[PDB]
């Protein structure tokens, strides 16, 4: 990592990030099996089989009920029917609105008749088979058959004539083992009305994630990247519920597609910088902070940091929440004297004190003379800085103090550079096009 301080505009950039961007969605359709658990009956006292058989059957009744609630909440997620504004906003529509809607529309196509018939018919002999849908889209279909393999053959024979209390206790404990995955699946869909927020170890176990990531049609680099980041692959995909068709549960999980795997990216963060006199006590501000990433010779701009993650060097952004910017916009970081690109800047007559945390360094602005001191761990107070826009590295300091509020600094080690230049002496209007 490399960070360069720009005293000309009191901003910094870190220019050593690789990146991955999500481009599309790879869908996967699962199908559990419970078998004919609804027919056999336990009717002799309380036993271990008694308390588990009733537990399993109760899950099936509940899961049929939540299907009548998903159908009601899908009308509110696809169009602003009665969303209203009011207050305490959940701020839906930021990124997910264009993602959940696409996923739901696939579910409607699947949950029709003669479609689940095809999915189930294609898996009659094997536990893995790729199949196409009505509208050309191809899906991967997986069948998991532990309970049906256990309830059918070596549970019914034990439970005869409704005599459901046997000296054999191995079966009683064993039934609890195979039942655990099913109970977790139904409970998750029940609490979220069918739309789980992220993949869990019960919708798609690890052995079923490697087989679902090495079967996609992709490059040989994308596969090797996604196998080393299972944590963030799991954390960026959601599942949907299709329904309860017979004695089985059918649901689909959306997996992300990383269309770009290696390309430089950088962060820009700015701080107010006046260096003005008491008269005309106003100055400039860079409102161009955020992320930058290259995909096809045209940078994508993310206005705020919350839209992208970080796992060391990699940056897990999304392509649906970025705005296309001409690649000449990198010139602003080089210099402001250049007039080739109209460089964004905003002014203001009320300069406030503010501190910006850099991923490697730190930025401080301190104008009204309040005690703004650098701090550390072994030494409480090191020195009192003058005015503001004094970039401080975490190698030299540990904390910064402003209005009796401390800020901690990260321990990441990397190269630091400072670029000498003349700050804006007085208020200028060569480039102040926006505001």
């Amino acid at each position, epitope marked *: 990592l490399k960070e360069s301080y720009l005293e000309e505009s009191c901003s910094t950039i870190t220019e050593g990030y690789l990146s991955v961007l999500r481009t599309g969605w790879y869908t996967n359709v699962f199908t559990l099996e419970v078998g004919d658990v609804e027919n056999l009956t336990c009717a002799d006292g309380p036993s271990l089989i008694k308390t588990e058989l009733d537990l399993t059957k109760s899950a099936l009744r509940e899961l049929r009920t939540v299907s009548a609630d998903q159908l009601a909440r899908e009308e509110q997620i696809e169009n602003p029917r009665r969303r209203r504004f009011v207050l305490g906003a959940i701020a839906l529509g930021v990124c997910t609105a264009a993602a959940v809607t696409a996923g739901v529309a696939i579910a409607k196509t699947i949950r029709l008749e003669s479609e689940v018939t095809a999915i189930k018919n294609a898996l009659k002999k094997t536990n893995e088979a790729v199949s196409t849908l009505g509208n050309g889209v191809r899906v991967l279909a997986t069948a998991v058959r532990e309970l049906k393999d256990f309830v059918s053959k070596n549970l019914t024979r034990a439970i005869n004539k409704n005599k459901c209390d046997i000296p054999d206790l191995k079966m009683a404990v064993s039934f609890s083992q195979f039942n655990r995955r099913f109970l977790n699946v139904v409970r998750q869909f029940s609490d979220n009305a069918g739309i789980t927020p992220a993949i869990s170890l019960d919708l798609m176990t690890d052995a079923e994630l490697a087989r679902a990531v090495s079967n996609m*049609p992709t490059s*040989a680099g994308q596969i090797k990247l996604m196998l080393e980041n299972r944590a963030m692959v799991r954390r960026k995909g959601f599942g949907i519920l299709i329904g309860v068709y017979g004695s089985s549960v059918i649901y689909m999980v959306q997996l992300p597609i990383f269309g770009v*795997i*290696d*390309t430089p990216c950088w962060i820009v963060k700015a701080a107010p910088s006046c260096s003005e006199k008491k008269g005309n006590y106003a100055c400039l501000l860079r409102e161009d902070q955020g992320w930058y990433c290259q*995909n*096809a010779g045209s940078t994508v701009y993310y206005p705020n940091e919350k839209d992208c993650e970080t796992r060391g060097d990699h940056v897990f952004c999304d392509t649906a929440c970025g705005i296309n910017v001409a690649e000449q916009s990198k010139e602003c970081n080089i210099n402001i004297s250049t007039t080739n690109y109209p460089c964004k800047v905003s002014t203001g007559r009320h300069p406030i004190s503010m501190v910006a945390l850099s991923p490697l360094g730190a930025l401080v602005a301190c104008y009204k003379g309040v005690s703004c001191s650098i701090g550390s761990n072994r030494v409480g107070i090191i020195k009192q800085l003058n005015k503001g826009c004094s970039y401080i590295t975490n190698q030299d300091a540990d904390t910064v103090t402003i209005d009796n509020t401390v800020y901690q600094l990260s321990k990441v080690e990397g190269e630091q550079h400072v670029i000498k230049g003349r700050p804006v002496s007085s208020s200028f209007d060569p480039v102040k096009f926006p505001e």
Partner: antibody
Amino acid sequence: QVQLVESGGGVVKPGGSLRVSCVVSGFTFSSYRMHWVRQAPGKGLEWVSSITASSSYINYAESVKGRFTISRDNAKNSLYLQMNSLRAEDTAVYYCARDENTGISHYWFDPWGQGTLVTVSS
Amino acid sequence: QAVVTQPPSVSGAPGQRVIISCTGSGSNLGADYGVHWYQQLPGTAPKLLIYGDRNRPSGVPDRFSGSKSGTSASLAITGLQAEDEADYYCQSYDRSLNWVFGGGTKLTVLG
């Protein structure tokens, strides 16, 4: 306006080494994966190597694994292909081609270069 | 593991229609990959003809077309003429062999 130029071809005795080069111009070099494609004289095309845009993931053809070396330098806008233990059946014309993809299931080489020739004989 | 098979040569006459078939396998085209076509004139480097299994880049004279279905793809030329005399290749991707190229066919005009 995209333009690729190859250089470094020549004649080398078997069991030697050579460093082919390819210098690009007219597009942002540090955003595209680049390839090396060879063609024997009078034969069909064949893929040889590949490298991502930051020298992170490198793929080699099975026939030449462990003997070649692909490298990049984003500052000078060029990529190199160091060869070792050259054999008689390795003479061909070498191309450097940019990579194009739609994201999931399409991959092709749109801007093919001009080419350089390498002869291996005893 | 897998390889793409292409006929050695196909001969035709001016004014007719020519079909070139690119036969894949279970791991090349069966896994939903692409087929792309390159034309190599006898003296220069190849150029892109068909990408995305049906599309046409700018400069293609609106008479070349192709399609993919199952594990086989074909290339169609309507209104054959004299200067369409070159070698044609079909490309794809493979699970274990990475990028793969077809055998390469030579088109002959009988005029």
